[PDB]
Amino acid sequence: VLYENQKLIANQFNSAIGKIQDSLSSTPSALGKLQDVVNHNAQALNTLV
Amino acid sequence: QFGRDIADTTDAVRDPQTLEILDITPCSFGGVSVITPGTNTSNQVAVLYQ
Ligand SMILES: *[C@@H]1O[C@H](CO)[C@@H](O[C@@H]2O[C@H](CO)[C@@H](O)[C@H](O)[C@H]2NC(C)=O)[C@H](O)[C@H]1NC(C)=O
C-alpha cells in the first residue's frame, strides 16, 4: 500500500510538516513548559534577593 | 536622589558636590575551582575562575 500511494504519502507528509512549521509560530501558548521552568527559576532567584 | 532596580538594590547614586550621577556596580566576585588529575599521576593543578 506504500508503493501504490508513494506520491500521496509524500504530499501529505510535506503538507503536515509545513502546517506544523506554521502552527509552531501561530499559536502563542504552545511553549508552556519551557517558559514556566525558566520563569520559575527566575522568580525563585529573585525572591531570595 | 538615588536609584534602584527590580531586585531592591542600589544601582545609581547622585553626588552632592556635582550635578552629575555616578553608577554603582559591585566588585567582581566569583568562585574558584581547581582542575586536577589524580595525585598519584601528577602534583600540578590548574586554577579556574568562574
Ligand atoms: C558645593 O561645593 C562644590 C565644590 O566647590 C561646588 O561645585 C563647584 O563650585 C564652584 C565654586 O563656586 C562653582 O564655580 C562650580 O560651578 C561648581 N560646580 C558644580 C557642578 O556645581 C558646588 O556648586 C557646591 N554646591 C552648592 C553651592 O550648592
PDB file of C-alpha atoms and ligand atoms in Angstrom:
ATOM      1  CA  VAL A   1       0.000   0.000   0.000  1.00  0.00           C
ATOM      2  CA  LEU A   2       3.034   2.280   0.312  1.00  0.00           C
ATOM      3  CA  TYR A   3       4.204   1.536  -3.216  1.00  0.00           C
ATOM      4  CA  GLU A   4       0.803   2.266  -4.768  1.00  0.00           C
ATOM      5  CA  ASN A   5       0.470   5.529  -2.796  1.00  0.00           C
ATOM      6  CA  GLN A   6       4.003   6.972  -2.598  1.00  0.00           C
ATOM      7  CA  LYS A   7       3.222  10.380  -4.129  1.00  0.00           C
ATOM      8  CA  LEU A   8       0.153  10.797  -1.904  1.00  0.00           C
ATOM      9  CA  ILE A   9       2.125   9.936   1.256  1.00  0.00           C
ATOM     10  CA  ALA A  10       4.937  12.315   0.260  1.00  0.00           C
ATOM     11  CA  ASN A  11       2.478  15.158  -0.388  1.00  0.00           C
ATOM     12  CA  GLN A  12       0.641  14.536   2.901  1.00  0.00           C
ATOM     13  CA  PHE A  13       3.900  14.432   4.877  1.00  0.00           C
ATOM     14  CA  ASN A  14       5.200  17.645   3.291  1.00  0.00           C
ATOM     15  CA  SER A  15       1.883  19.434   3.877  1.00  0.00           C
ATOM     16  CA  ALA A  16       1.879  18.269   7.511  1.00  0.00           C
ATOM     17  CA  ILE A  17       5.466  19.485   8.004  1.00  0.00           C
ATOM     18  CA  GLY A  18       4.598  22.906   6.574  1.00  0.00           C
ATOM     19  CA  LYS A  19       1.436  23.030   8.691  1.00  0.00           C
ATOM     20  CA  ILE A  20       3.325  22.291  11.909  1.00  0.00           C
ATOM     21  CA  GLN A  21       6.002  24.846  10.960  1.00  0.00           C
ATOM     22  CA  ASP A  22       3.281  27.491  10.629  1.00  0.00           C
ATOM     23  CA  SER A  23       1.441  26.290  13.752  1.00  0.00           C
ATOM     24  CA  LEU A  24       4.514  26.457  15.995  1.00  0.00           C
ATOM     25  CA  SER A  25       4.501  30.235  15.394  1.00  0.00           C
ATOM     26  CA  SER A  26       0.763  30.909  15.029  1.00  0.00           C
ATOM     27  CA  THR A  27      -0.180  29.589  18.483  1.00  0.00           C
ATOM     28  CA  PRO A  28       1.367  31.689  21.291  1.00  0.00           C
ATOM     29  CA  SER A  29       0.630  29.274  24.175  1.00  0.00           C
ATOM     30  CA  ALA A  30       2.361  26.235  22.631  1.00  0.00           C
ATOM     31  CA  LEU A  31       5.536  26.661  24.733  1.00  0.00           C
ATOM     32  CA  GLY A  32       4.157  26.261  28.241  1.00  0.00           C
ATOM     33  CA  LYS A  33       6.679  24.014  29.969  1.00  0.00           C
ATOM     34  CA  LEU A  34       9.985  25.648  28.964  1.00  0.00           C
ATOM     35  CA  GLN A  35       8.701  29.161  29.680  1.00  0.00           C
ATOM     36  CA  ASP A  36       7.270  28.014  33.021  1.00  0.00           C
ATOM     37  CA  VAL A  37      10.508  26.348  34.146  1.00  0.00           C
ATOM     38  CA  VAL A  38      12.689  29.326  33.176  1.00  0.00           C
ATOM     39  CA  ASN A  39      10.208  31.753  34.785  1.00  0.00           C
ATOM     40  CA  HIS A  40      10.097  29.626  37.945  1.00  0.00           C
ATOM     41  CA  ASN A  41      13.904  29.638  38.109  1.00  0.00           C
ATOM     42  CA  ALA A  42      13.985  33.421  37.599  1.00  0.00           C
ATOM     43  CA  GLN A  43      11.290  34.060  40.222  1.00  0.00           C
ATOM     44  CA  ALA A  44      12.904  31.735  42.775  1.00  0.00           C
ATOM     45  CA  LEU A  45      16.221  33.519  42.252  1.00  0.00           C
ATOM     46  CA  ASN A  46      14.540  36.937  42.507  1.00  0.00           C
ATOM     47  CA  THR A  47      12.629  36.219  45.725  1.00  0.00           C
ATOM     48  CA  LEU A  48      15.874  35.336  47.539  1.00  0.00           C
ATOM     49  CA  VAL A  49      17.354  38.763  46.769  1.00  0.00           C
TER      50      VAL A  49
ATOM     51  CA  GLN B   1      18.469  61.312  44.864  1.00  0.00           C
ATOM     52  CA  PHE B   2      19.360  57.651  44.257  1.00  0.00           C
ATOM     53  CA  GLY B   3      18.035  54.863  42.062  1.00  0.00           C
ATOM     54  CA  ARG B   4      17.156  51.196  42.494  1.00  0.00           C
ATOM     55  CA  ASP B   5      16.133  48.242  40.327  1.00  0.00           C
ATOM     56  CA  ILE B   6      13.884  45.167  40.344  1.00  0.00           C
ATOM     57  CA  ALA B   7      15.989  43.291  42.917  1.00  0.00           C
ATOM     58  CA  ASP B   8      15.725  46.139  45.507  1.00  0.00           C
ATOM     59  CA  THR B   9      19.412  47.008  45.128  1.00  0.00           C
ATOM     60  CA  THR B  10      21.101  50.367  44.615  1.00  0.00           C
ATOM     61  CA  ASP B  11      22.377  50.927  41.071  1.00  0.00           C
ATOM     62  CA  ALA B  12      22.838  54.681  40.538  1.00  0.00           C
ATOM     63  CA  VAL B  13      23.651  57.445  43.019  1.00  0.00           C
ATOM     64  CA  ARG B  14      23.952  61.231  42.747  1.00  0.00           C
ATOM     65  CA  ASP B  15      26.802  63.057  44.437  1.00  0.00           C
ATOM     66  CA  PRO B  16      26.009  66.333  46.255  1.00  0.00           C
ATOM     67  CA  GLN B  17      29.110  68.198  45.053  1.00  0.00           C
ATOM     68  CA  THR B  18      28.165  67.889  41.362  1.00  0.00           C
ATOM     69  CA  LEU B  19      25.001  67.670  39.271  1.00  0.00           C
ATOM     70  CA  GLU B  20      26.446  64.526  37.662  1.00  0.00           C
ATOM     71  CA  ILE B  21      25.399  60.995  38.612  1.00  0.00           C
ATOM     72  CA  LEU B  22      27.646  58.002  39.302  1.00  0.00           C
ATOM     73  CA  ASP B  23      26.595  54.412  38.640  1.00  0.00           C
ATOM     74  CA  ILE B  24      27.187  51.615  41.150  1.00  0.00           C
ATOM     75  CA  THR B  25      28.246  48.095  40.156  1.00  0.00           C
ATOM     76  CA  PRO B  26      29.580  45.677  42.807  1.00  0.00           C
ATOM     77  CA  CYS B  27      33.152  44.411  42.805  1.00  0.00           C
ATOM     78  CA  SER B  28      33.639  41.300  40.674  1.00  0.00           C
ATOM     79  CA  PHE B  29      33.100  38.236  42.867  1.00  0.00           C
ATOM     80  CA  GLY B  30      33.403  34.646  41.726  1.00  0.00           C
ATOM     81  CA  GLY B  31      34.065  31.136  42.951  1.00  0.00           C
ATOM     82  CA  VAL B  32      37.352  29.356  42.360  1.00  0.00           C
ATOM     83  CA  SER B  33      37.824  25.801  41.113  1.00  0.00           C
ATOM     84  CA  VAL B  34      40.862  23.537  40.875  1.00  0.00           C
ATOM     85  CA  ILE B  35      41.414  21.486  37.730  1.00  0.00           C
ATOM     86  CA  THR B  36      43.403  18.460  38.814  1.00  0.00           C
ATOM     87  CA  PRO B  37      44.264  14.912  37.772  1.00  0.00           C
ATOM     88  CA  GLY B  38      44.980  12.208  40.315  1.00  0.00           C
ATOM     89  CA  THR B  39      47.715  12.954  42.832  1.00  0.00           C
ATOM     90  CA  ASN B  40      49.169   9.528  42.022  1.00  0.00           C
ATOM     91  CA  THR B  41      49.730  10.844  38.477  1.00  0.00           C
ATOM     92  CA  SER B  42      50.981  14.419  38.903  1.00  0.00           C
ATOM     93  CA  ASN B  43      51.227  17.159  41.520  1.00  0.00           C
ATOM     94  CA  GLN B  44      50.294  20.047  39.201  1.00  0.00           C
ATOM     95  CA  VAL B  45      46.928  21.821  39.329  1.00  0.00           C
ATOM     96  CA  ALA B  46      45.146  24.416  37.201  1.00  0.00           C
ATOM     97  CA  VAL B  47      43.070  27.257  38.646  1.00  0.00           C
ATOM     98  CA  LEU B  48      39.682  28.043  37.092  1.00  0.00           C
ATOM     99  CA  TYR B  49      37.790  31.235  37.940  1.00  0.00           C
ATOM    100  CA  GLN B  50      34.013  31.041  37.497  1.00  0.00           C
TER     101      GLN B  50
HETATM  102  C1  LIG C   1      29.365  72.563  46.763  1.00  0.00           C
HETATM  103  O1  LIG C   1      30.784  72.681  46.545  1.00  0.00           O
HETATM  104  C2  LIG C   1      31.221  72.312  45.227  1.00  0.00           C
HETATM  105  C3  LIG C   1      32.729  72.410  45.228  1.00  0.00           C
HETATM  106  O2  LIG C   1      33.161  73.758  45.092  1.00  0.00           O
HETATM  107  C4  LIG C   1      30.555  73.213  44.189  1.00  0.00           C
HETATM  108  O3  LIG C   1      30.935  72.795  42.882  1.00  0.00           O
HETATM  109  C5  LIG C   1      31.520  73.870  42.102  1.00  0.00           C
HETATM  110  O4  LIG C   1      31.810  75.045  42.901  1.00  0.00           O
HETATM  111  C6  LIG C   1      32.422  76.115  42.161  1.00  0.00           C
HETATM  112  C7  LIG C   1      32.725  77.213  43.154  1.00  0.00           C
HETATM  113  O5  LIG C   1      31.735  78.233  43.121  1.00  0.00           O
HETATM  114  C8  LIG C   1      31.494  76.567  41.035  1.00  0.00           C
HETATM  115  O6  LIG C   1      32.142  77.577  40.271  1.00  0.00           O
HETATM  116  C9  LIG C   1      31.135  75.386  40.141  1.00  0.00           C
HETATM  117  O7  LIG C   1      30.186  75.789  39.160  1.00  0.00           O
HETATM  118  C10 LIG C   1      30.558  74.242  40.970  1.00  0.00           C
HETATM  119  N1  LIG C   1      30.266  73.094  40.127  1.00  0.00           N
HETATM  120  C11 LIG C   1      29.069  72.499  40.094  1.00  0.00           C
HETATM  121  C12 LIG C   1      28.944  71.329  39.165  1.00  0.00           C
HETATM  122  O8  LIG C   1      28.132  72.887  40.782  1.00  0.00           O
HETATM  123  C13 LIG C   1      29.040  73.134  44.333  1.00  0.00           C
HETATM  124  O9  LIG C   1      28.410  74.047  43.442  1.00  0.00           O
HETATM  125  C14 LIG C   1      28.612  73.457  45.764  1.00  0.00           C
HETATM  126  N2  LIG C   1      27.171  73.311  45.906  1.00  0.00           N
HETATM  127  C15 LIG C   1      26.329  74.334  46.105  1.00  0.00           C
HETATM  128  C16 LIG C   1      26.946  75.701  46.183  1.00  0.00           C
HETATM  129  O10 LIG C   1      25.119  74.162  46.219  1.00  0.00           O
END
